[PDB]
């Protein structure tokens, strides 16, 4: 239903069953139509950095007033509108416009608040046999994740199943949804203080903080890195119609770009199957947003691989802090198919800590295989057992394994 | 061996070596009586090879029939272009006064008004009791405004037991001695009278007594493993076993809400 | 493989490593992409594979059109006369007019007209609705009661049909081990990187899909993939998570007059059995009835179901700790600890034996389509092979009727799953029978552990019909400290003459002095030796027990062999010692070894193979042994170093042996 000017006409005949009202002229005040190839022509016409700047203009942000990494964060903010079942969390201090993008940058996105969020309303009303919000919107975002709640005790596990795969059972029938899950939250503390004495997602309430669920996120947008919204950050140039970009993301969601990776830069061994899926989906979303036409090089793949391996490593180390034994595998191994060089990515969150450490942890300095001195930290966990020794973090070094 | 030949002659078609059933009384979607009828008519006396071949035949036939509910619609479609697809199925048949045409209903396939000739029903019978497992070769014909399902039974064979022929008992009973008849009844459960004391055989017959007397209330109590649990749940299809003790007077006796008699009436 | 897989099978040419490296970030069931690649990507050319992948993605996001603007597509159908769409479609027959109708689960049209020939071609449109490409045609005539939409062309993008003779030919051609490896790689696992026994466990995991009412439980550490497998094989399995399903929802909704979950699916699997809750207690009991027969009575009517139950659970402790401190089914909550519940468990899949899921464990050759797997598991879901064993083997006497039934069902399942052709030799039957006996014996051991003496017969065995040899299978995978009274260890020369360790357990009850024997492996020699010992104990009760009456206490002794050396004859003396210990209620010495045999008159016989017996006691982890005086001349025959390792409680007669064992 589009806002239009109609030239309504009246014509009535005796015995008619149709309405006497006829529409003679229509003026489509919203938008006539949209050719898919129309945007592709421009995307092929313009360069990558120009494309990213145009996308930033599409939100109404000024790319020149912001850093390149800030533009990457905004692109990650755009990704949920282009990826199906894109579970993502942005947690940060106030003033970064987290809720603006999910409220005014798309009519196909809903910003749910209040926190009552009953599974009958959210997911499926068994009384009315009708789908919830997840079946009608494209991007559903919980605002105030601190204030979210769940009346149905099983709602948490239902959410875990939905983000594990976009199809959940309902009593006796498996329903599905394509809306992307977004969690927007505010931080009341400085970054260091909050993340050292706890985990990043501490604002999330106890009922849903856990090993899983937090696993299912495809990205954590570090909202603290975004500066507080100021008029200097607001562009005044030409920008893509928010309807135009939203509908483009509409037809983009049915596409995917996960398979360009195999012809190009490899992935490491320290990432499990879920990590593999999450990073592939995030990379796919970034290529969709930046290279919708499909014309790209290998360095173009690098551009999004690094950012994905960073945002997912943040969640990986948070899960490490939460759970301990299951999730120390945080060494995100960036690999290439051609050079065979095993690059590594470390989040900006990630010298020697002061004070007396817990027993079994120490620090050493040694000459690496490249011959320059470097600092390493060894963490030993003791358990009841039969004298077995397990080793990890050695980067497949056989000599180190033999010395151990 | 004389008892075996007496049972074969006097009670032909109503006696089978129960052990064979225990061989294949598992791993299927078919009730026990279907097999219990599918072995007495292929196994003649004691021939090993013939018995094994009969097992093979039963397995092969079952590997083609009692099609599951899920694909029910499916088979009907094939029907429209080839017609004959005989199926093992639990079928119930009713007589429609207005139509004057027997109106077969399929428990699994969901067809509720298939037509059957009176010749078929009058011989086999036992269809018009509670529905039995039968093989049906189905006949088909479409008519404009036929006001009836275009479904008919061209051929039928009762994979369950046909009618009873009570007389066969009497004469048959006159052919056996008292202790021989007692041992035959005990072996009908599958028990060994030679391995059991005669008083215990009296008690085993007392177990069957509730099935010949109306309102024959009886109490059996004893150590685990006396077979009191296997009986009354597989030694009869017209009797019901209640487990757990959780019952309502509505379910057992009469539900005042539904105007329906309880379990005691069925 | 590859040659056979391409020839003896249809376009099942997909790695299932492809699917993981396929753009699995989109909107389509996975096996649709799998069939797409199975046809547009054959052989091994990387270029063809990539090009077919591109074509699959293009045709995917050419005519998907998600539900939102469904009616929009209708416009294109009317304006263009014909339009191409991809959708899940169901076909039904309208008996009132005999005109095949098409219902779109996505577009919402429930009555599109489709030709009868296409209906005959594709039976899978006729079962549960399949994903296909449709060519919708628009035709409207005034006064019509039929739909204006018609499907002129249908392309079965998901699965065309099933043919059983193809499966038969493929199995007949494929060799046993290669066919098993193909089945395992069809799950996505690499047989080459995995042991044979773990492949047997993986086959056991597919067994729920090939037999009706296959009550099976698998408890194990995290990372064994016991949750994933049923997640791809979900077309006929359900992963109930947390137990959030009531008896009305699971079995029968008495309000709606509709059957529960068990009546619609072929397999139901309770994930995280530690957290499942069936609300009302009664469910458990009616649960038992299902476990008894697959049919349950609800209210006034009995519903039969063909869904097989799997109990998936996570183990947090080490295997040895859980074995020694409790039963292996410890993760199961208190609502299921009852042996009256556990007894129908057909198998306990050893989840700990399964290696943690790692990339090297994933096959990359190719493998069949999981669709083919489940859809013929449906064929296996009906056929039985319970009578195969009777030609070759006979079950032992230590298995009850339920154990026999469970083993038969497991064997039939395994073998048909592995032999669609049948391969009716004797060795395959022996392998399936031993594996089923092992998995059932583990459950029997747990049942004994939980229920005490009610499941003492744990000695699973099978007798070969030709060689008459009884093979005694043993559970897969002398302790310090004083054991409870009535338990002891002895060493003897079995019927084949090698030394072996045996453990005797005496249970004492209030009664009239009866003697019951178990675990004697049908050995008359052992029975008469125990009878002589019991007669001696009864005769000398007053002096040995000091007043405790044998006639007032009933004895039940069990013999278990730990080295599988064979049946032992010499058992009178250790059985008498166990009798005395149990009657007095006094624990025998820790790590105490009783050697030798006795006569009814109290005479001791020399310990045969005394050196080998002491060697076994050294291997048995014991520090004490009792020897009769007749073995004294054999002391120099023993090496000094081994003899110095033991405290030799050198007795003279049965009474002195009893005293030394009791201390």
Short mmCIF file of N, CA and C in Angstrom, two decimals, chain C residues 15-142:
data_model
loop_
_atom_site.label_atom_id
_atom_site.label_comp_id
_atom_site.label_asym_id
_atom_site.label_seq_id
_atom_site.Cartn_x
_atom_site.Cartn_y
_atom_site.Cartn_z
N UNK C 15 29.60 -34.14 -2.49
CA UNK C 15 30.48 -34.47 -1.38
C UNK C 15 29.79 -34.40 -0.02
N UNK C 16 28.85 -33.47 0.15
CA UNK C 16 28.29 -33.06 1.43
C UNK C 16 29.34 -32.28 2.21
N UNK C 17 30.56 -32.25 1.67
CA UNK C 17 31.55 -31.23 2.01
C UNK C 17 31.28 -30.04 1.10
N UNK C 18 30.76 -30.33 -0.10
CA UNK C 18 30.30 -29.27 -1.00
C UNK C 18 29.24 -28.41 -0.33
N UNK C 19 28.23 -29.05 0.27
CA UNK C 19 27.13 -28.33 0.88
C UNK C 19 27.63 -27.38 1.97
N UNK C 20 28.58 -27.85 2.77
CA UNK C 20 29.19 -26.98 3.77
C UNK C 20 29.99 -25.86 3.14
N UNK C 21 30.62 -26.10 1.99
CA UNK C 21 31.28 -25.06 1.22
C UNK C 21 30.37 -24.44 0.17
N UNK C 22 29.09 -24.81 0.17
CA UNK C 22 28.07 -24.14 -0.61
C UNK C 22 27.57 -22.95 0.20
N UNK C 23 26.97 -21.98 -0.48
CA UNK C 23 26.47 -20.76 0.17
C UNK C 23 25.28 -21.15 1.03
N UNK C 24 25.58 -21.73 2.20
CA UNK C 24 24.56 -22.12 3.16
C UNK C 24 24.25 -20.95 4.09
N UNK C 25 24.00 -19.81 3.45
CA UNK C 25 23.60 -18.59 4.13
C UNK C 25 22.40 -18.00 3.43
N UNK C 26 21.51 -18.86 2.95
CA UNK C 26 20.40 -18.43 2.11
C UNK C 26 19.10 -19.10 2.52
N UNK C 27 18.10 -19.04 1.66
CA UNK C 27 16.75 -19.49 2.01
C UNK C 27 16.26 -20.66 1.16
N UNK C 28 16.61 -21.87 1.58
CA UNK C 28 16.24 -23.10 0.88
C UNK C 28 16.63 -24.28 1.76
N UNK C 29 15.82 -25.33 1.83
CA UNK C 29 16.28 -26.55 2.52
C UNK C 29 17.52 -27.12 1.84
N UNK C 30 18.41 -27.66 2.66
CA UNK C 30 19.77 -27.96 2.22
C UNK C 30 19.77 -29.03 1.13
N UNK C 31 18.90 -30.03 1.27
CA UNK C 31 18.92 -31.15 0.35
C UNK C 31 18.36 -30.77 -1.02
N UNK C 32 17.67 -29.63 -1.11
CA UNK C 32 17.36 -29.08 -2.43
C UNK C 32 18.63 -28.65 -3.15
N UNK C 33 19.49 -27.89 -2.46
CA UNK C 33 20.79 -27.55 -3.03
C UNK C 33 21.58 -28.81 -3.34
N UNK C 34 21.45 -29.81 -2.48
CA UNK C 34 22.18 -31.06 -2.68
C UNK C 34 21.75 -31.75 -3.96
N UNK C 35 20.44 -31.83 -4.23
CA UNK C 35 19.98 -32.41 -5.49
C UNK C 35 20.38 -31.54 -6.67
N UNK C 36 20.34 -30.22 -6.50
CA UNK C 36 20.76 -29.32 -7.57
C UNK C 36 22.19 -29.62 -8.00
N UNK C 37 23.08 -29.76 -7.03
CA UNK C 37 24.48 -30.04 -7.33
C UNK C 37 24.66 -31.47 -7.83
N UNK C 38 23.81 -32.39 -7.37
CA UNK C 38 23.89 -33.77 -7.79
C UNK C 38 23.64 -33.97 -9.27
N UNK C 39 22.98 -33.01 -9.91
CA UNK C 39 22.72 -33.06 -11.34
C UNK C 39 23.59 -32.09 -12.12
N UNK C 40 23.66 -30.82 -11.73
CA UNK C 40 24.44 -29.88 -12.52
C UNK C 40 25.94 -29.97 -12.26
N UNK C 41 26.35 -30.82 -11.32
CA UNK C 41 27.77 -31.03 -11.02
C UNK C 41 28.03 -32.53 -10.88
N UNK C 42 28.65 -33.12 -11.90
CA UNK C 42 29.05 -34.51 -11.92
C UNK C 42 30.56 -34.60 -12.15
N UNK C 43 31.08 -35.81 -12.25
CA UNK C 43 32.50 -36.07 -12.52
C UNK C 43 33.34 -35.40 -11.43
N UNK C 44 34.56 -35.00 -11.77
CA UNK C 44 35.45 -34.39 -10.79
C UNK C 44 36.08 -33.09 -11.26
N UNK C 45 35.63 -32.50 -12.37
CA UNK C 45 36.23 -31.29 -12.90
C UNK C 45 35.89 -30.10 -12.01
N UNK C 46 36.89 -29.42 -11.44
CA UNK C 46 36.60 -28.25 -10.58
C UNK C 46 35.85 -27.15 -11.30
N UNK C 47 36.17 -26.93 -12.58
CA UNK C 47 35.53 -25.87 -13.35
C UNK C 47 34.04 -26.13 -13.53
N UNK C 48 33.69 -27.38 -13.85
CA UNK C 48 32.30 -27.76 -14.03
C UNK C 48 31.57 -27.60 -12.70
N UNK C 49 32.22 -27.97 -11.61
CA UNK C 49 31.64 -27.87 -10.27
C UNK C 49 31.33 -26.42 -9.94
N UNK C 50 32.30 -25.53 -10.17
CA UNK C 50 32.08 -24.11 -9.87
C UNK C 50 31.00 -23.52 -10.77
N UNK C 51 31.01 -23.89 -12.05
CA UNK C 51 30.03 -23.34 -12.98
C UNK C 51 28.62 -23.79 -12.62
N UNK C 52 28.47 -25.06 -12.25
CA UNK C 52 27.20 -25.58 -11.80
C UNK C 52 26.75 -24.93 -10.51
N UNK C 53 27.70 -24.63 -9.62
CA UNK C 53 27.38 -23.90 -8.41
C UNK C 53 26.83 -22.51 -8.73
N UNK C 54 27.47 -21.82 -9.68
CA UNK C 54 26.98 -20.51 -10.10
C UNK C 54 25.58 -20.62 -10.69
N UNK C 55 25.35 -21.63 -11.53
CA UNK C 55 24.04 -21.82 -12.13
C UNK C 55 22.98 -22.11 -11.07
N UNK C 56 23.34 -22.93 -10.08
CA UNK C 56 22.42 -23.23 -8.99
C UNK C 56 22.05 -21.96 -8.24
N UNK C 57 23.04 -21.12 -7.93
CA UNK C 57 22.74 -19.88 -7.22
C UNK C 57 21.88 -18.95 -8.05
N UNK C 58 22.15 -18.87 -9.36
CA UNK C 58 21.36 -17.99 -10.22
C UNK C 58 19.91 -18.45 -10.31
N UNK C 59 19.69 -19.75 -10.56
CA UNK C 59 18.32 -20.24 -10.64
C UNK C 59 17.64 -20.15 -9.28
N UNK C 60 18.42 -20.26 -8.20
CA UNK C 60 17.87 -20.07 -6.87
C UNK C 60 17.31 -18.67 -6.71
N UNK C 61 18.17 -17.65 -6.82
CA UNK C 61 17.65 -16.29 -6.72
C UNK C 61 17.28 -15.71 -8.08
N UNK C 62 16.61 -16.51 -8.90
CA UNK C 62 15.85 -16.00 -10.04
C UNK C 62 14.35 -16.09 -9.78
N UNK C 63 13.86 -17.19 -9.22
CA UNK C 63 12.43 -17.43 -9.07
C UNK C 63 12.06 -17.95 -7.68
N UNK C 64 12.78 -17.50 -6.65
CA UNK C 64 12.39 -17.85 -5.29
C UNK C 64 11.11 -17.16 -4.86
N UNK C 65 11.02 -15.85 -5.07
CA UNK C 65 10.00 -14.95 -4.54
C UNK C 65 9.43 -15.41 -3.21
N UNK C 66 9.98 -14.89 -2.11
CA UNK C 66 9.56 -15.18 -0.75
C UNK C 66 8.08 -14.84 -0.54
N UNK C 67 7.43 -15.37 0.51
CA UNK C 67 5.96 -15.30 0.61
C UNK C 67 5.35 -13.91 0.55
N UNK C 68 6.04 -12.89 1.06
CA UNK C 68 5.45 -11.56 1.27
C UNK C 68 4.57 -11.10 0.12
N UNK C 69 5.14 -10.92 -1.07
CA UNK C 69 4.32 -10.50 -2.20
C UNK C 69 3.85 -11.66 -3.07
N UNK C 70 3.25 -12.67 -2.44
CA UNK C 70 2.79 -13.83 -3.19
C UNK C 70 1.81 -13.41 -4.28
N UNK C 71 0.81 -12.61 -3.92
CA UNK C 71 -0.20 -12.17 -4.88
C UNK C 71 0.45 -11.42 -6.04
N UNK C 72 1.58 -10.75 -5.78
CA UNK C 72 2.28 -10.06 -6.86
C UNK C 72 2.59 -11.02 -8.00
N UNK C 73 3.09 -12.21 -7.66
CA UNK C 73 3.40 -13.20 -8.69
C UNK C 73 2.16 -13.50 -9.52
N UNK C 74 1.00 -13.58 -8.86
CA UNK C 74 -0.24 -13.85 -9.58
C UNK C 74 -0.44 -12.85 -10.71
N UNK C 75 -0.14 -11.57 -10.46
CA UNK C 75 -0.26 -10.57 -11.51
C UNK C 75 0.59 -10.95 -12.71
N UNK C 76 1.85 -11.31 -12.47
CA UNK C 76 2.72 -11.72 -13.57
C UNK C 76 2.16 -12.92 -14.30
N UNK C 77 1.47 -13.81 -13.58
CA UNK C 77 0.85 -14.95 -14.24
C UNK C 77 -0.26 -14.49 -15.17
N UNK C 78 -1.07 -13.52 -14.72
CA UNK C 78 -2.18 -13.07 -15.54
C UNK C 78 -1.69 -12.20 -16.69
N UNK C 79 -0.73 -11.32 -16.42
CA UNK C 79 -0.29 -10.38 -17.43
C UNK C 79 0.55 -11.05 -18.51
N UNK C 80 1.32 -12.08 -18.15
CA UNK C 80 2.21 -12.74 -19.10
C UNK C 80 1.66 -14.05 -19.65
N UNK C 81 0.55 -14.55 -19.11
CA UNK C 81 -0.02 -15.79 -19.59
C UNK C 81 0.68 -17.01 -19.01
N UNK C 82 1.99 -16.90 -18.81
CA UNK C 82 2.77 -17.96 -18.20
C UNK C 82 3.91 -17.33 -17.42
N UNK C 83 4.26 -17.95 -16.29
CA UNK C 83 5.35 -17.44 -15.48
C UNK C 83 6.04 -18.59 -14.76
N UNK C 84 7.35 -18.44 -14.54
CA UNK C 84 8.14 -19.48 -13.89
C UNK C 84 8.44 -19.09 -12.45
N UNK C 85 8.17 -20.00 -11.52
CA UNK C 85 8.39 -19.77 -10.10
C UNK C 85 8.98 -21.05 -9.50
N UNK C 86 9.65 -20.92 -8.36
CA UNK C 86 10.14 -22.06 -7.60
C UNK C 86 9.39 -22.06 -6.27
N UNK C 87 8.81 -23.21 -5.91
CA UNK C 87 8.00 -23.30 -4.71
C UNK C 87 7.88 -24.75 -4.26
N UNK C 88 7.51 -24.93 -3.00
CA UNK C 88 7.10 -26.24 -2.50
C UNK C 88 5.63 -26.44 -2.84
N UNK C 89 5.34 -27.52 -3.56
CA UNK C 89 4.02 -27.77 -4.12
C UNK C 89 3.53 -29.12 -3.62
N UNK C 90 2.23 -29.21 -3.35
CA UNK C 90 1.57 -30.45 -2.99
C UNK C 90 0.48 -30.74 -4.01
N UNK C 91 0.29 -32.01 -4.34
CA UNK C 91 -0.73 -32.40 -5.31
C UNK C 91 -1.72 -33.33 -4.63
N UNK C 92 -3.01 -33.04 -4.83
CA UNK C 92 -4.09 -33.82 -4.26
C UNK C 92 -5.11 -34.15 -5.34
N UNK C 93 -5.86 -35.22 -5.13
CA UNK C 93 -6.90 -35.63 -6.06
C UNK C 93 -8.27 -35.28 -5.49
N UNK C 94 -9.07 -34.57 -6.28
CA UNK C 94 -10.43 -34.19 -5.89
C UNK C 94 -11.38 -35.25 -6.44
N UNK C 95 -11.80 -36.16 -5.56
CA UNK C 95 -12.65 -37.27 -5.99
C UNK C 95 -13.97 -36.77 -6.56
N UNK C 96 -14.44 -35.61 -6.11
CA UNK C 96 -15.71 -35.07 -6.59
C UNK C 96 -15.67 -34.74 -8.08
N UNK C 97 -14.48 -34.50 -8.64
CA UNK C 97 -14.38 -34.15 -10.05
C UNK C 97 -13.24 -34.89 -10.75
N UNK C 98 -12.41 -35.63 -10.01
CA UNK C 98 -11.24 -36.30 -10.56
C UNK C 98 -10.37 -35.34 -11.36
N UNK C 99 -9.89 -34.28 -10.71
CA UNK C 99 -9.03 -33.30 -11.36
C UNK C 99 -7.90 -32.91 -10.41
N UNK C 100 -6.68 -33.32 -10.74
CA UNK C 100 -5.53 -33.10 -9.87
C UNK C 100 -5.32 -31.62 -9.57
N UNK C 101 -5.17 -31.29 -8.30
CA UNK C 101 -5.06 -29.92 -7.83
C UNK C 101 -3.69 -29.68 -7.20
N UNK C 102 -3.21 -28.44 -7.30
CA UNK C 102 -1.88 -28.07 -6.83
C UNK C 102 -2.00 -26.99 -5.77
N UNK C 103 -1.41 -27.23 -4.61
CA UNK C 103 -1.42 -26.30 -3.48
C UNK C 103 0.01 -25.82 -3.25
N UNK C 104 0.18 -24.50 -3.24
CA UNK C 104 1.48 -23.90 -2.95
C UNK C 104 1.56 -23.56 -1.47
N UNK C 105 2.54 -24.14 -0.78
CA UNK C 105 2.76 -23.81 0.62
C UNK C 105 3.25 -22.38 0.77
N UNK C 106 3.79 -21.80 -0.31
CA UNK C 106 4.31 -20.45 -0.25
C UNK C 106 3.34 -19.45 -0.87
N UNK C 107 2.99 -19.63 -2.15
CA UNK C 107 2.12 -18.67 -2.82
C UNK C 107 0.69 -18.69 -2.29
N UNK C 108 0.25 -19.80 -1.71
CA UNK C 108 -1.07 -19.83 -1.12
C UNK C 108 -2.21 -20.25 -2.03
N UNK C 109 -1.93 -20.57 -3.29
CA UNK C 109 -2.97 -21.10 -4.16
C UNK C 109 -3.16 -22.58 -3.85
N UNK C 110 -4.39 -22.97 -3.52
CA UNK C 110 -4.68 -24.33 -3.07
C UNK C 110 -5.32 -25.22 -4.14
N UNK C 111 -5.55 -24.71 -5.35
CA UNK C 111 -6.33 -25.47 -6.32
C UNK C 111 -5.84 -25.34 -7.76
N UNK C 112 -4.55 -25.09 -7.97
CA UNK C 112 -4.03 -24.97 -9.33
C UNK C 112 -4.18 -26.29 -10.08
N UNK C 113 -4.53 -26.20 -11.36
CA UNK C 113 -4.79 -27.39 -12.16
C UNK C 113 -3.49 -27.92 -12.75
N UNK C 114 -3.28 -29.23 -12.63
CA UNK C 114 -2.06 -29.89 -13.09
C UNK C 114 -2.44 -31.15 -13.84
N UNK C 115 -1.69 -31.46 -14.90
CA UNK C 115 -2.02 -32.59 -15.76
C UNK C 115 -1.80 -33.91 -15.03
N UNK C 116 -2.55 -34.93 -15.45
CA UNK C 116 -2.47 -36.24 -14.80
C UNK C 116 -1.16 -36.94 -15.12
N UNK C 117 -0.62 -36.74 -16.32
CA UNK C 117 0.64 -37.38 -16.66
C UNK C 117 1.76 -36.98 -15.74
N UNK C 118 1.87 -35.68 -15.46
CA UNK C 118 2.90 -35.19 -14.54
C UNK C 118 2.69 -35.78 -13.15
N UNK C 119 1.43 -35.96 -12.76
CA UNK C 119 1.13 -36.59 -11.48
C UNK C 119 1.66 -38.02 -11.46
N UNK C 120 1.46 -38.77 -12.54
CA UNK C 120 2.00 -40.12 -12.59
C UNK C 120 3.52 -40.12 -12.57
N UNK C 121 4.15 -39.13 -13.22
CA UNK C 121 5.61 -39.11 -13.29
C UNK C 121 6.24 -38.96 -11.91
N UNK C 122 5.72 -38.05 -11.08
CA UNK C 122 6.37 -37.67 -9.83
C UNK C 122 5.45 -38.02 -8.66
N UNK C 123 5.74 -39.15 -8.01
CA UNK C 123 4.93 -39.57 -6.87
C UNK C 123 5.22 -38.75 -5.62
N UNK C 124 6.35 -38.06 -5.59
CA UNK C 124 6.72 -37.32 -4.38
C UNK C 124 5.96 -36.01 -4.24
N UNK C 125 5.41 -35.48 -5.34
CA UNK C 125 4.41 -34.42 -5.21
C UNK C 125 3.19 -34.92 -4.45
N UNK C 126 3.02 -36.23 -4.40
CA UNK C 126 1.80 -36.87 -3.94
C UNK C 126 1.87 -37.33 -2.49
N UNK C 127 3.00 -37.12 -1.82
CA UNK C 127 3.18 -37.62 -0.47
C UNK C 127 3.19 -36.52 0.59
N UNK C 128 4.08 -35.53 0.49
CA UNK C 128 4.17 -34.50 1.50
C UNK C 128 4.52 -33.14 0.92
N UNK C 129 4.51 -33.04 -0.40
CA UNK C 129 4.81 -31.78 -1.06
C UNK C 129 6.30 -31.59 -1.24
N UNK C 130 6.73 -31.36 -2.47
CA UNK C 130 8.15 -31.26 -2.78
C UNK C 130 8.43 -29.92 -3.44
N UNK C 131 9.67 -29.46 -3.29
CA UNK C 131 10.10 -28.25 -3.99
C UNK C 131 10.25 -28.55 -5.47
N UNK C 132 9.59 -27.74 -6.30
CA UNK C 132 9.67 -27.87 -7.75
C UNK C 132 9.60 -26.48 -8.37
N UNK C 133 9.97 -26.41 -9.65
CA UNK C 133 9.76 -25.23 -10.46
C UNK C 133 8.43 -25.41 -11.18
N UNK C 134 7.57 -24.41 -11.11
CA UNK C 134 6.25 -24.44 -11.73
C UNK C 134 6.15 -23.37 -12.81
N UNK C 135 5.45 -23.72 -13.89
CA UNK C 135 5.07 -22.77 -14.92
C UNK C 135 3.57 -22.50 -14.79
N UNK C 136 3.23 -21.41 -14.11
CA UNK C 136 1.84 -21.06 -13.88
C UNK C 136 1.25 -20.40 -15.12
N UNK C 137 0.09 -20.89 -15.53
CA UNK C 137 -0.66 -20.36 -16.65
C UNK C 137 -2.00 -19.81 -16.16
N UNK C 138 -2.43 -18.71 -16.77
CA UNK C 138 -3.64 -18.01 -16.36
C UNK C 138 -4.71 -18.18 -17.42
N UNK C 139 -5.88 -18.66 -17.00
CA UNK C 139 -7.01 -18.84 -17.90
C UNK C 139 -8.30 -18.65 -17.11
N UNK C 140 -9.09 -17.66 -17.51
CA UNK C 140 -10.33 -17.32 -16.81
C UNK C 140 -11.49 -17.37 -17.78
N UNK C 141 -12.50 -18.18 -17.46
CA UNK C 141 -13.75 -18.20 -18.21
C UNK C 141 -14.90 -17.85 -17.28
N UNK C 142 -15.88 -17.12 -17.82
CA UNK C 142 -16.99 -16.65 -17.01
C UNK C 142 -17.79 -17.81 -16.44
#
